[PDB]
Design an enzyme around this catalytic site. Sequence first.
Site, PDB file in Angstrom:
ATOM      1  N   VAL A   1       0.771  -1.261   0.000  1.00  0.00           N
ATOM      2  CA  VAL A   1       0.000   0.000   0.000  1.00  0.00           C
ATOM      3  C   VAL A   1       0.799   1.307   0.000  1.00  0.00           C
ATOM      4  O   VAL A   1       0.188   2.358   0.083  1.00  0.00           O
ATOM      5  CB  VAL A   1      -0.964   0.033   1.209  1.00  0.00           C
ATOM      6  CG1 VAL A   1      -1.658  -1.299   1.342  1.00  0.00           C
ATOM      7  CG2 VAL A   1      -0.252   0.354   2.509  1.00  0.00           C
ATOM      8  N   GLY A   2       2.127   1.270  -0.090  1.00  0.00           N
ATOM      9  CA  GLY A   2       2.966   2.483   0.067  1.00  0.00           C
ATOM     10  C   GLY A   2       4.420   2.216   0.472  1.00  0.00           C
ATOM     11  O   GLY A   2       4.714   1.287   1.238  1.00  0.00           O
TER      12      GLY A   2
ATOM     13  N   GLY B   1      10.011   3.234   5.931  1.00  0.00           N
ATOM     14  CA  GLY B   1       9.670   1.846   5.601  1.00  0.00           C
ATOM     15  C   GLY B   1       8.720   1.664   4.427  1.00  0.00           C
ATOM     16  O   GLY B   1       8.287   2.633   3.811  1.00  0.00           O
TER      17      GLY B   1
ATOM     18  N   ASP C   1       1.937   9.143  12.957  1.00  0.00           N
ATOM     19  CA  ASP C   1       3.338   9.516  13.269  1.00  0.00           C
ATOM     20  C   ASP C   1       3.638  10.899  13.850  1.00  0.00           C
ATOM     21  O   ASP C   1       4.492  11.625  13.345  1.00  0.00           O
ATOM     22  CB  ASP C   1       4.131   9.280  12.013  1.00  0.00           C
ATOM     23  CG  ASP C   1       3.571  10.028  10.863  1.00  0.00           C
ATOM     24  OD1 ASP C   1       3.506   9.459   9.746  1.00  0.00           O
ATOM     25  OD2 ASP C   1       3.178  11.193  11.094  1.00  0.00           O
TER      26      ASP C   1
END
EC number: 2.7.11.24
Length: 331
Positions: A26-27, A28, A160
Amino acid sequence: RPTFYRQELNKTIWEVPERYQNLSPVGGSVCAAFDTKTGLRVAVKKLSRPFQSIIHAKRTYRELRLLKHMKHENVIGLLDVFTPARSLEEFNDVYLVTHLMGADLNNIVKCQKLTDDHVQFLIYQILRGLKYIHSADIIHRDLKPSNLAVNEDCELKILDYVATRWYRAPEIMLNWMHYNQTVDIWSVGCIMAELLTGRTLFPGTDHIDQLKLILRLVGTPGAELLKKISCESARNYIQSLTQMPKMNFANVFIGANPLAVDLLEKMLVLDSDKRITAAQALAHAYFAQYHDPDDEPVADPYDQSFESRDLLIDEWKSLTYDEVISFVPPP
Ligand SMILES: *[C@H](CC(C)=O)c1cccc(-c2nc(NCCc3ccccc3)c3ccc(N)cc3n2)c1
């Protein structure tokens, strides 16, 4: 010890416990997966070369500690952490598992006109999570629509292009070294404005334009703020500017709920010393439908003393290994 399996996805090898199935990129790097143990869909993040260097290793440790500490409904936490390594000697890969949330606030805002009620709920949640983060002596610093994840029920969690600068408090734009937690409040004010209008409040082209946009809304600093500026450069800048009055926000956010307007006035204060805190904002009348002071928890104190340490790679690595081994899953 669980049983792992290997597989390659877009020139990356993933080695994970059988608990996690249907890994889908989907996208470290991040994969969506199925948590067979809980029927949850989850995001599995494999950290990009976590012990390559001292700076990589300290970051890796920083990320893990922070995620292990965050236990709150409006903040992304850690469902699981693992490594395929069986010893410290072979420890070279870190995987972090969290809730997979459907979408983010930037998706939502780009694809629907929100109701005031819905804005209340969303902003309330951000502040509730901010209260907890701030009580831990943590500053987010990077709050923006893409850092806020939402499920189909609109439950929000803080994480985050949607440029960072557009949400940055003016004191960070001016480079103040002693900014406080209320820089996050400024970001929340800018997010709220955008949710209510479908428009980026301050879409600056660069740092100078960003400040021009800001000062047009909030006005130029008065004497009370100028007497708090310690450095000559910043004082020379402030004294440069065309004396501008603060706009009356009612003329900016026409037809918004006037309690929304009032709150924005309290968030988007130039002087951070006079900016409302997350705790105070939660008790604002705007959130009367959602506010409950017995269910707006604070966090345990968060030990950030490692930030000031200078350690070897092996030392950061070992510390991270320890944090992995000692991980206790949430119930
Ligand atoms: C001086 C050098 C240091 C100590 O970093 C200095 C540089 C940059 C900023 C400050 C400072 N700024 C703010 N807020 C600035 C608001 C502003 C106004 C106009 C345009 C952009 C930003 C402060 C607010 C409150 C206090 N107490 C101190 C501040 N210092 C200092």
